């Protein structure tokens, strides 16, 4: 019944058998003995000259004697102190081509360090404050910044960097849940989270076990010091080949806590960053001295960052809500709301646009961002509050805090940071920001591990590493489009559309191709049946199952000009000669349909000459759009294409319908639809996306492109208002273009969404085209 020879062990025991794991504390679980042997002080943690060669004492946090390293308990400056060694961070960077390791390594070990609320701006503080990793930056692969998940909290962002899982594929939806299912609540404080049932995917600890590559319990009880959780992790590298575990997790509550006291502005967040410093250069010292410092590879990562806010900017439910008893609230930097044991319709209403000053917005979770993931989940409630940063909704009416996260994961102040360094990462590398989401590939990568199924696009981050295991490569196409002729009379169709000889050859099934599909064919990779449809000014998949085009690709030069939809062709809706009536829409389904109108994909705007125009009528062409969103799209096409396209020296347009009425981030099935224009097989999309091609030399037009590519791309809830824009009332040029920048997302987002892959046809690797469908554009 004793830690004496097991002060964390890998082992866990009993009862009736006492532990002394990490974790032993957390449950109380320890021996008698524990704190004495395995939470030791004396001496502190660094040697002095005083201590060389010191005869071992038991009693002491670290030793200086001779045999420390067989043990690997060594103070972490040994080295340093007695034997003349330099401090790692005092060493020139020096390139690590090939792995480095003591004999009986089989591979690299991975240690991820991770640090909370450690946001990306901290980096800027410099080698003043913190050398060891500024050091680390410099010498290994970095971003700008690394996106954390939504919500920009501890357990949803540390177990999607485990699993690449979003929240709602992981189930830690929040550090507060409520699961229905188990009837019971998850806590920060509690044992409840230690149960599995929690938590689903596959971290990488157990990615790694199932492969026989043995980890290191990656969960620190909270009082064991830092300094005792880099030494634990040294001398478990120190034991023999069999035992030493080839994946780690450090772990730093810091800069998190001080943020929540001081704020993100406070010039004393210096203390608690240089903290955190010495941290690692203990741990860069430690690896020095047992030769595996240019063996390991290391990961300095955080989970999400911090915003200054304080107790006074808080919204209360109860100046809204008249009912407030009447509901649970999961309160803060975001808002989940829930029946106590009550209407959600007229609980939004009363959320919606109440105030000048409303620091919220209300959402069912179906109707949120689509590049939040945050709905397909029993524990995510249907009513959603996205608080505005820098404030706090709670239920019911100085202060303690100072700073909080948890906002909207593309707010700048919830950035966090990575960092690579080790053989099998770049050396002196600077690459674009990414989404922690990409991090558990890249660190099976590391391992040489096959990861489990999960939301990071393999591939996208192979420009971090020196050396990749892992090739990917396009997806195979599914299904192959027709290419109709010309097999249909005008006379033939019935359709019901007012529109007020020609030598015909016309639909140009050429030209086409080369000025308006830049990159390629989009491949559908689902089975279906559909149709290109070619046009002067445009090119289009039309779906025969769901009547109307899957995709519709044009490009926009800088010099483009807009046009009205003149009077005599407001009504216009034209039969195509290319499909039948059978595999068409109609008119009648719209002039049934007293909530349903219609729009177009391809804009009558942006026609090439008045003829041309004719075949942006097409019904083809056209798509199910409420009134509401008309606003919307119309401002988009006579006005925001115009303007891009201006800014960025022309634009391809590829837009397109969306269907996720089960809100899971996924194409549709038919049987999923859930919503019809009126007595009609012509389906209603939940929402509409485009990609904004253009190229990232500015100096050259969009369909002269010689290099990398740039891109924007929105996917638009399909709304039958606009209560979601608060100044909606006003002109669309006050509103429409915040509503799309809300609702930006990124290429992958939309492929996940509509089972169509972009991109196939470029002169760019396709490790590139990866990263470039996993960008999102922010405008913070
Ligand atoms: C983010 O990545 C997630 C993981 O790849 C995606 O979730 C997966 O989505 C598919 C399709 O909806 C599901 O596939 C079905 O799986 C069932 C049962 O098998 C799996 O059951 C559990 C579910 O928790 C899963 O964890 C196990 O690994 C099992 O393999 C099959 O019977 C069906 O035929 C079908 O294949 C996956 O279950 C699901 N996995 C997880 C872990 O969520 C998610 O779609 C991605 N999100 C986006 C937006 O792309
Ligand atoms: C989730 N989590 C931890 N994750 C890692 C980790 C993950 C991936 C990596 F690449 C590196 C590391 C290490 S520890 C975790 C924690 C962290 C504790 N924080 C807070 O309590 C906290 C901190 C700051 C906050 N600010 C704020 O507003 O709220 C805050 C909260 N604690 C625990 C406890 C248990 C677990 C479980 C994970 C799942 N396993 S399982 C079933 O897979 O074996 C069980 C343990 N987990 N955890
Ligand atoms: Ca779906
Ligand atoms: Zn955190
Ligand atoms: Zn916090």
Same mark, same amino acid.
């Not at 707010?411 to 600077?430: D, E």
């Not at 996208?460 to 249909?488: A, K, Q, W």
């Given at each position: 019944?004793?830690?004496?020879?097991?002060?964390? %062990?890998?082992?866990?025991?009993?009862?009736?058998?006492?532990?002394?794991?990490?974790?032993?504390?957390?449950?109380?679980?320890?021996?008698?003995?524990?704190?004495?042997?395995?939470?030791?002080?004396?001496?502190?943690?660094?040697?002095?000259?005083?201590?060389?060669? %010191?005869?071992?004492?038991?009693?002491?946090?670290?030793?200086?004697?001779?045999?420390?390293?067989?043990? !690997?308990?060594?103070?972490? &400056? *040994?080295?340093?102190?007695?034997?003349?060694?330099?401090?790692?961070?005092?060493?020139?960077?020096?390139?690590?081509?090939?792995?480095?390791?003591?004999?009986?390594? #089989?591979?690299?070990?991975?240690?991820?360090?991770?640090?909370? !609320?450690?946001?990306?701006? $901290?980096?800027?503080?410099?080698?003043?404050?913190?050398?060891?990793?500024?050091?680390?930056?410099?010498?290994?692969?970095?971003?700008?910044?690394?996106?954390? #998940?939504?919500?920009?909290?501890?357990?949803?962002?540390? *177990?999607?960097?485990?699993?690449?899982?979003?929240?709602?594929?992981?189930?830690?939806?929040?550090?507060?849940?409520?699961?229905?299912?188990?009837?019971?609540?998850?806590?920060?404080?509690?044992?409840?989270?230690?149960?599995?049932?929690?938590?689903?995917?596959?971290?990488?600890?157990?990615?790694?076990?199932?492969?026989?590559?043995?980890?290191?319990?990656?969960?620190?009880?909270?009082? @064991?010091?830092?300094?005792?959780?880099?030494?634990?992790?040294?001398?478990?590298?120190?034991?023999?080949?069999?035992?030493?575990?080839?994946?780690?997790?450090?772990?730093? %509550?810091?800069?998190?806590?001080?943020?929540? +006291?001081?704020?993100?502005?406070?010039?004393?967040?210096? &203390?608690?960053?240089?903290?955190?410093?010495?941290?690692?250069?203990?741990?860069?010292?430690?690896?020095?001295?047992?030769?595996?410092?240019?063996?390991?590879?290391?990961?300095?990562?955080?989970?999400?960052?911090?915003?200054?806010?304080?107790?006074?900017?808080?919204?209360?439910?109860?100046?809204?809500?008249?009912?407030?008893?009447?509901?649970?609230?999961?309160?803060?930097?975001?808002?989940?709301?829930?029946?106590?044991?009550?209407?959600?319709?007229?609980?939004?209403?009363?959320?919606?646009?109440?105030?000048?000053?409303?620091?919220?917005?209300?959402?069912? +979770?179906?109707?949120?961002?689509?590049?939040?993931?945050?709905? /397909?989940?029993?524990?995510?409630?249907?009513?959603?509050?996205?608080?505005?940063?820098?404030?706090?909704?709670?239920?019911?009416?100085?202060?303690?805090?100072?700073?909080?996260?948890?906002?909207? /994961?593309?707010?700048?102040?919830?950035?966090?940071?990575?960092?690579?360094?080790?053989?099998?990462?770049?050396?002196?590398?600077? #690459?674009?920001?990414?989404?922690?989401?990409?991090?558990?590939?890249?660190?099976?990568?590391?391992?040489?591990?096959?990861?489990?199924?999960? /939301?990071?696009?393999?591939?996208?981050?192979?420009?971090?590493?020196?050396?990749?295991?892992?090739?990917?490569?396009?997806?195979?196409?599914?299904?192959?489009?027709?290419?109709?002729?010309?097999?249909?009379?005008?006379?033939?169709?019935?359709?019901?559309?007012?529109?007020?000889?020609?030598?015909?050859?016309?639909?140009?099934?050429?030209?086409?191709?080369?000025?308006?599909?830049?990159?390629?064919?989009?491949? #559908?990779?689902?089975?279906?049946?559909?149709?290109?449809?070619?046009?002067?000014?445009?090119?289009?998949?039309?779906?025969? @199952?769901?009547?109307?085009?899957?995709?519709?690709? *044009?490009?926009?030069?800088?010099?483009?000009?807009?046009?009205?939809?003149?009077?005599?062709?407001?009504?216009?809706?034209?039969?195509?000669?290319?499909?039948?009536?059978?595999?068409?829409? &109609?008119?009648?389904?719209?002039?049934?349909?007293?909530?349903?109108?219609?729009?177009?994909?391809?804009?009558?705007?942006?026609?090439?000459?008045?003829?041309?125009? $004719?075949?942006?009528?097409?019904?083809? &062409?056209?798509?199910?759009?409420?009134?509401?969103?008309?606003?919307?799209?119309?401002?988009?096409?006579?006005?925001?294409?115009?303007? *891009?396209?201006?800014?960025?020296?022309?634009?391809?347009?590829?837009?397109?319908?969306?269907?996720? $009425?089960?809100?899971?981030?996924?194409?549709?099935?038919?049987? %999923?639809?859930?919503? $019809?224009?009126?007595?009609?097989?012509?389906?209603?999309?939940?929402?509409?996306?485009?990609?904004?091609?253009?190229?990232?030399?500015?100096?050259?037009?969009?369909?002269?492109?010689?290099?990398?590519?740039?891109?924007?791309?929105?996917?638009?809830?399909?709304?039958?208002?606009?209560?979601?824009?608060?100044?909606?009332?006003?002109?669309?040029?006050?509103?429409?273009?915040?509503?799309?920048?809300?609702?930006?997302?990124?290429?992958?987002?939309?492929?996940?969404?509509?089972?169509?892959?972009?991109?196939?046809?470029?002169?760019?690797?396709?490790?590139?085209?990866?990263?470039?469908?996993?960008?999102?554009?922010?405008?913070?």
């Amino acid at each position: 019944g004793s830690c004496k020879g097991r002060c964390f %062990e890998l082992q866990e025991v009993g009862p009736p058998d006492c532990r002394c794991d990490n974790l032993c504390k957390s449950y109380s679980s320890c021996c008698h003995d524990f704190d004495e042997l395995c939470l030791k002080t004396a001496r502190g943690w660094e040697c002095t000259k005083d201590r060389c060669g %010191e005869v071992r004492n038991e009693e002491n946090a670290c030793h200086c004697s001779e045999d420390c390293l067989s043990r !690997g308990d060594c103070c972490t &400056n *040994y080295q340093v102190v007695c034997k003349g060694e330099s401090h790692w961070v005092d060493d020139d960077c020096e390139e690590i081509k090939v792995p480095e390791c003591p004999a009986g390594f #089989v591979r690299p070990p991975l240690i991820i360090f991770s640090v909370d !609320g450690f946001r990306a701006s $901290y980096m800027k503080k410099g080698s003043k404050v913190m050398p060891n990793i500024e050091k680390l930056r410099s010498c290994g692969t970095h971003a700008p910044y690394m996106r954390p #998940v939504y919500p920009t909290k501890t357990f949803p962002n540390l *177990y999607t960097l485990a699993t690449g899982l979003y929240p709602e594929s992981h189930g830690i939806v929040g550090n507060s849940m409520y699961d229905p299912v188990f009837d019971a609540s998850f806590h920060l404080r509690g044992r409840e989270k230690f149960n599995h049932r929690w938590w689903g995917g596959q971290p990488l600890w157990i990615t790694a076990t199932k492969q026989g590559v043995r980890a290191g319990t990656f969960f620190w009880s909270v009082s @064991i010091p830092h300094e005792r959780r880099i030494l634990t992790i040294l001398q478990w590298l120190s034991l023999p080949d069999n035992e030493r575990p080839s994946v780690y997790a450090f772990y730093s %509550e810091q800069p998190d806590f001080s943020g929540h +006291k001081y704020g993100p502005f406070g010039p004393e967040m210096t &203390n608690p960053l240089r903290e955190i410093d010495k941290t690692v250069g203990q741990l860069m010292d430690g690896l020095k001295q047992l030769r595996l410092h240019r063996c390991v590879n290391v990961i300095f990562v955080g989970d999400h960052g911090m915003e200054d806010v304080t107790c006074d900017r808080t919204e209360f439910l109860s100046n809204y809500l008249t009912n407030v008893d009447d509901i649970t609230l999961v309160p803060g930097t975001l808002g989940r709301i829930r029946a106590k044991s009550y209407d959600p319709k007229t609980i939004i209403a009363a959320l919606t646009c109440k105030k000048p000053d409303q620091h919220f917005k209300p959402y069912m +979770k179906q109707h949120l961002p689509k590049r939040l993931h945050y709905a /397909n989940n029993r524990r995510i409630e249907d009513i959603h509050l996205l608080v505005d940063r820098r404030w706090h909704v709670a239920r019911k009416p100085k202060c303690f805090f100072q700073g909080d996260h948890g906002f909207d /994961n593309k707010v700048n102040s919830m950035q966090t940071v990575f960092v690579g360094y080790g053989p099998t990462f770049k050396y002196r590398t600077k #690459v674009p920001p990414f989404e922690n989401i990409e991090l558990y590939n890249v660190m099976c990568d590391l391992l040489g591990l096959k990861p489990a199924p999960n /939301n990071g696009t393999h591939g996208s981050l192979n420009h971090l590493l020196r050396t990749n295991t892992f090739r990917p490569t396009m997806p195979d196409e599914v299904s192959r489009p027709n290419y109709p002729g010309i097999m249909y009379l005008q006379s033939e169709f019935d359709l019901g559309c007012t529109c007020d000889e020609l030598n015909k050859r016309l639909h140009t099934k050429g030209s086409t191709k080369e000025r308006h599909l830049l990159y390629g064919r989009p491949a #559908v990779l689902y089975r279906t049946s559909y149709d290109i449809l070619y046009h002067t000014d445009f090119e289009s998949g039309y779906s025969e @199952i769901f009547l109307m085009p899957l995709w519709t690709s *044009y490009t926009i030069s800088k010099q483009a000009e807009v046009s009205s939809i003149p009077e005599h062709l407001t009504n216009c809706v034209r039969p195509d000669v290319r499909v039948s009536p059978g595999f068409s829409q &109609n008119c009648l389904a719209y002039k049934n349909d007293k909530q349903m109108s219609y729009g177009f994909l391809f804009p009558p705007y942006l026609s090439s000459s008045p003829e041309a125009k $004719y075949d942006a009528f097409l019904v083809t &062409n056209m798509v199910p759009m409420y009134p509401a969103f008309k606003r919307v799209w119309a401002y988009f096409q006579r006005v925001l294409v115009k303007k *891009y396209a201006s800014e960025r020296n022309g634009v391809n347009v590829i837009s397109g319908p969306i269907f996720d $009425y089960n809100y899971d981030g996924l194409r549709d099935t038919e049987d %999923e639809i859930k919503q $019809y224009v009126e007595g009609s097989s012509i389906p209603v999309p939940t929402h509409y996306y485009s990609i904004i091609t253009s190229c990232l030399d500015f100096t050259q037009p969009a369909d002269k492109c010689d290099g990398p590519l740039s891109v924007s791309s929105f996917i638009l809830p399909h709304r039958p208002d606009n209560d979601e824009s608060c100044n909606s009332s006003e002109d669309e040029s006050k509103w429409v273009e915040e509503l799309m920048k809300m609702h930006t997302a990124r290429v992958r987002d939309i492929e996940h969404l509509t089972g169509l892959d972009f991109y196939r046809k470029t002169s760019r690797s396709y490790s590139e085209i990866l990263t470039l469908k996993t960008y999102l554009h922010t405008y913070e």
